[PDB]
From a paper:
As the pentose phosphate pathway (PPP) is the main NADPH supplier in most parasites, the enzymes of this key metabolic pathway are considered promising drug targets for the control of unicellular parasites such as Leishmania, Trypanosoma and Plasmodium. Under native conditions, the SEC profiles of Ld6PGD wt revealed one stable peak representing a molecular mass of 94–111 kDa, which is equivalent to the dimeric form of the Ld6PGD wt and in accordance with previously published SEC profiles from Leishmania 6PGDs. Each subunit of the homodimer comprises a NADP+ and a 6PG binding site. The C-terminal tail of domain 2 (M438-Q478) invades the neighboring subunit so that each active site is built by residues of both subunits.
In addition, we solved the three-dimensional crystal structure of Ld6PGD in complex with NADP(H), revealing a previously unknown conformation of NADPH. The crystal contained two monomers in the asymmetric unit (AU), which were essentially similar to an RMSD of 0.4 Å (478 residues). The omit maps displayed clear density for one phosphate ion in each subunit and one NADP(H) molecule in subunit A. In subunit B, most of the NADP(H) molecule is well defined by electron density, except for the nicotinamide and the adenine moieties, which are not visible. In our Ld6PGD structure, NADP(H) is located at the conserved NADP+ binding site. The amino acids N31, R32 and T33 interact with one of the phosphates, N31 and N104 with the ribose moieties and the diphosphates are bound by main chain atoms of residues V11 and M12. Via van der Waals forces, I129 and S130 interact with the nicotinamide ring, which is also hydrogen bonded to a phosphate ion. According to this, the active site loop residues (D257-T262) of the Ld6PGD structure, complexed with a phosphate at the 6PG binding site, adopt the closed conformation. Since Ld6PGD was crystallized under catalysis, in the presence of both substrates, 6PG and NADP+, it could be also the products (R5P, NADPH) or an intermediate state of substrate and product that are visible in the active site. Since crystallization with an excess of 6PG and NADP+ in the crystallization buffer, and thus under catalysis, could have resulted in a feedback inhibition by high concentrations of the product NADPH, we suggest that Ld6PGD is complexed with NADPH in its inhibitory conformation, in which the nicotinamide ring occupies part of the 6PG binding site. As the nicotinamide ring occupies part of the 6PG binding pocket, we hypothesize that only the phosphate component of 6PG can bind at the usual site, while the rest of the 6PG molecule must be flexible and therefore not visible in the electron density.
Author numbering:
A (entry chain B), B (entry chain A): 1 to 478
Write the structure that this text describes.
């Protein structure tokens, strides 16, 4: 008899089984292809553990070995595979047993699974996993959301394998009812989507100045020593630049510029649009990936028009990390992460009102500190910012001093990138527009477009002096 | 007995009845509030065609007075109102009767509504109308899509009341099966969304230079005389700017900068994201409207942060249309509509592949020339561009000479606006990122982010030198 069950021996599924088994819990593993299950026990037999790891080839034996109430963890591809696995388990579980879906699924679908499963005496919990392969093996951050009773039942198992923060608290906190955990996980990736693109966009800017791959990460390493931008994404960005093939060439040169995506980044952008929360940086991150996927279109576009005006190339004479071009981008990069995280948090607060999770916002920022993708220094002030003022109008209001210090310095270098080079900067320029619009009392295009709609649609417009709607009568124009 | 029925006596519904009545067809009208139906006949009883206008207070009398097979046109609010009307019509029509939904609905629901009505012997058609209040009465453009058999019954009515182009063709063409007609209408507004924001953004740019409300439309009038930007949307922009109250103050000063939205702009951005077509300008137009709706956020943000660095103000001493800033902005504006229209058609072509509309694209662009919101000179070359090369990779490839002429001039003026002023330019700058990205064979941020995903997620990456996917072995970073 085992204590827990994990289904899906993928990158996240395989390492998670190793983690809990190392914790002393008896882990039962199952995968759709039984060959993987046999190989899993074969390679991981020389460890100081895995006597608790017993693999099974049939589903009936997988369920029967679990302590009642059963706790089955699902780590398969989100969507059809998760739906396929849950219905397969419905014939091998009993009343009161707990199923846990940990794949990066949609929170809308998460509530549907809860209703369909509670009708047959089954219990469901929706939680998200972040940290990647290494985070899975060492310790990830957990984002659980659903019925509060189920979370406490699996609380000891989750916290043991969870990442341990600097202070000592495990990086897991209950988020709320429904798909609150997956909603947080969905927007956890949304923040990851933008910042990962921000680092890549700054990578393009440095390359636009003739910086070869080595000095680009040299600039990044100096920014890490500053401490403000110290983050896991900075670590992987530096590692990507330093990557070199066996032939001596940089790895980044041979990599095709096509970025795959799986759901979570896309779904969060649509929902933010649907709820009405302005998230240009979050939406632009997804669109930027879509641009890279149309590689055949780009090749045809360049071939059909090769005389593209790319602007006057402006190589930077100083290629050291102390160069003004490097220094200006540091303030440009930092404010874009601040802007992007603000939009990520802005949707989450509005999402809490609409779907009624009962989200504990200050603790959810604190659960990012270690083990997850968004881990870094910036989570300190951001957790503190919403702890001091839970009613903060915008996350940037906590970082006023950093904005004043480098908002101007940010503006010229992007303009310098714009005028001198033809490098696309979708997310960074979206963030700058978000900062300006959210900090200007009156946006002139808001007034004019309101009039424009009234001209043809007679939709009316709002007035500043008095409440209500008024429509001025326009002359015929067709 | 009448031949056609119009349901919904709104701004669009009333004028469409006037159009068809002028054409000689007997129009039967019905509105949910019968007071509107009774009032409608009172003011339009002195017209030369008020014998053709017969109002009905009950739907049963409304249906019984229609020529068999019945053709009822629905022009009510999209969503719940249309669903209520459709179910109400199911009890008063018989087999072979045709229902036409003309509200700006979702094309996904349009195919679903057709299936639900064929199960009771009813026939459905999804069509969109654009042109506003004035366009509806003097002839709008129609975008019908659905069962091809249904189209022929309503062909004489739609083409007769349609706008007449310069050559003479009515601005109506069958688009395809399912919700193809409403899908064109949904992205018709998406193109309208961006350019309306582009004009408002150019209004912001000129206002940031001290041009004041009056001289801004004077600059706009010069661009109208140029002929390149000559369009209905340009005409209403000048009219909106020129609007002045009796007290002498500009109308734009008293208008609250909050922009409402009704479905089509939001839905098109989500669908473009869903299918994977990169349309940042279309998405940014919706996002820009969301920014203007957050009035409470900006007011609180400005109070919580009054020391906003607005940059070095650079007033243009020359406020004439011949000013270099105005001339550069003309080239900056023009290429962004070119970019935005390309994405609108790029989404439409990919949407045709996914849903199998069978879209006749060159004729679908040809229905835009007159009667719709986006009508103007620029639609001419675009119709010709896709006629010469139906497999054209991107509409920007057709406008090579205009791109070469002012792509650089567009880049500098945006940089001047960025450095000197803190005015948000979401849509225009999003288009510039689209222009740059679509014409570079290899995007460096696409390469770097591809490595970033492999570092933590082990997702792999594609290589330029050889086919396949590779995963580089990374050192521990947690
Ligand atoms: C996150 O966690 C979940 C699992 O990630 P990952 O470890 O990469 O596995 P994958 O997302 O690549 O899915 C692999 C698992 O699902 C099934 C497969 O069966 P089999 O391989 O035997 O065919 C295998 O067990 C995903 O939803 C991701 O978004
Ligand atoms: N965005 C654009 O560019 C364009 C928009 N359109 C679309 O055409 C359609 C009609 O536009 P418009 O003329 O302005 O009218 P409205 O969209 O303002 O809707 C008014 C009509 O809908 C009726 N109706 C309204 N609400 C309900 C409800 N819950 N239940 C049942 N019936 C209801 C109203 O009845 P009553 O008033 O008696 O209560 C009235 O007849 C819209 O969908 C619009 O999106 C058309 C052209 C251009």
């Amino acid at each position: 008899s085992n204590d827990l069950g994990i289904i899906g021996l993928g990158v996240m599924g395989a390492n998670l089984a190793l983690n809990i088994a190392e914790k002393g819990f008896k882990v039962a593993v199952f995968n759709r292809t039984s060959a993987k299950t046999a190989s899993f026990l074969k390679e991981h037999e020389s460890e100081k553990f895995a006597a608790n790891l017993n693999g099974y080839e049939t589903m009936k034996a997988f369920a029967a070995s679990l302590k009642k109430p059963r706790r089955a963890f699902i780590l398969v591809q989100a969507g059809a595979a998760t739906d396929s696995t849950i219905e397969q388990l419905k014939e091998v579980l009993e009343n009161g047993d707990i199923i846990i879906d940990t794949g990066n699924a949609n929170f809308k679908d998460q509530d549907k699974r809860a209703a369909q499963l509670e009708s047959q005496g089954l219990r469901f919990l929706g939680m998200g996993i972040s940290g990647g392969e290494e985070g899975a093996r060492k310790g990830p951050a957990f984002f659980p959301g659903g019925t509060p009773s189920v979370w406490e039942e699996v609380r000891p198992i989750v916290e043991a394998a969870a990442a341990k923060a600097e202070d000592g608290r495990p990086c897991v906190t209950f988020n709320g009812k429904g798909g609150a955990g997956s909603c947080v996980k969905m927007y956890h990736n949304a923040g990851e989507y933008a910042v990962l693109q921000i680092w890549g966009e700054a990578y393009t800017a440095l390359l636009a100045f003739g910086f070869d791959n080595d000095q680009i990460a040299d600039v990044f390493e100096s920014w890490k020593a500053d401490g403000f931008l110290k983050s896991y994404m900075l670590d992987i960005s530096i590692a990507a630049c330093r990557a070199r093939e066996a032939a001596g060439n940089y790895l980044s040169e041979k990599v095709k510029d096509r970025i795959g995506s799986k759901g979570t980044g896309l779904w969060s952008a649509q929902e933010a649009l649907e709820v009405g929360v302005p998230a240009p940086s979050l939406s632009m991150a997804v669109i930027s990936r879509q641009m890279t996927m149309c590689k055949e279109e780009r090749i045809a576009n360049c071939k059909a028009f090769p005389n593209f005006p790319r602007g006057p190339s402006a190589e930077a004479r100083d290629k050291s990390p102390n160069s003004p071009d490097a220094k200006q981008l540091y303030h440009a990069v930092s404010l874009c992460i601040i802007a992007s995280y603000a939009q990520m948090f802005q949707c989450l607060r509005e999402l809490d009102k609409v779907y009624g999770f009962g989200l504990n916002l200050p603790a959810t920022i604190a659960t990012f500190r270690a083990g997850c993708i968004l881990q870094g220094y910036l989570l300190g002030p951001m957790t503190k910012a919403f702890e001091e003022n839970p009613s903060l109008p915008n996350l940037m209001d906590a970082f006023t001093k950093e904005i004043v210090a480098g908002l101007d310095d940010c503006r010229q270098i992007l303009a310098k990138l714009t005028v001198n080079t033809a490098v696309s900067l979708p997310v960074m320029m979206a963030s700058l527009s978000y900062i300006n619009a959210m900090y200007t009392e009156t946006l002139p295009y808001g007034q004019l477009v309101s009039l424009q709609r009234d001209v043809f649609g007679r939709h009316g417009y709002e007035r500043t002096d008095k409440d209500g709607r008024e429509s001025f009568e326009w002359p015929a124009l067709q």
